[PDB]
């Protein structure tokens, strides 16, 4: 979420015309720590993100794997029946 | 002659209104630097003045001890005999 300390730096921007000024420098302090907290967490990620080499792995079987599932008509009474030998 | 530097810096007061403006920026090593100078050179006044014991001596004798001088009349002939045999 870089996108809230760049609108968080534009309106330091906005007033910050004078460096002078106290009326606003307190926040200098906030900027400060949290533009170096973002820049060094996404060094981190970026050297991170560059080295994998693997990006998926085949999921282990399914229970049941799907089969071709062709409408049906009164086959409810046997299907009942197999299920009840089952 | 502190007074000059002393005038220097008002004249830098004068245009002291706005630590944010570099106009005038330059010249505050040109500040920087005479004051440091008169500072220290100041403190080794300071030292070497507190020290003297002694303020004066005693001169050696005039080569002539002023004499009374009353007014004379009609000596300038035996003051010139005197400056001939002398």
């Given at each position: 979420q870089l996108d809230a300390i760049d609108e968080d730096y534009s309106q330091l921007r906005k007033y910050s015309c004078l460096?002078?000024?106290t009326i606003h420098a307190?926040?200098?302090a906030s900027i400060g720590r949290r533009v170096l907290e973002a820049l060094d967490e996404a060094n981190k990620l970026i050297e991170e993100?560059?080295?994998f080499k693997k990006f998926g792995f085949?999921?282990?079987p399914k229970?049941?794997?799907p089969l071709?599932?062709?409408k049906t008509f009164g086959l409810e009474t046997m299907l009942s029946q197999?299920?009840?030998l089952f």
């Amino acid at each position: 979420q870089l996108d809230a300390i760049d609108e968080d730096y534009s309106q330091l921007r906005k007033y910050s015309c004078l460096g002078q000024c106290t009326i606003h420098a307190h926040r200098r302090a906030s900027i400060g720590r949290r533009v170096l907290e973002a820049l060094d967490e996404a060094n981190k990620l970026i050297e991170e993100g560059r080295r994998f080499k693997k990006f998926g792995f085949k999921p282990l079987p399914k229970i049941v794997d799907p089969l071709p599932q062709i409408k049906t008509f009164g086959l409810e009474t046997m299907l009942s029946q197999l299920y009840d030998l089952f």
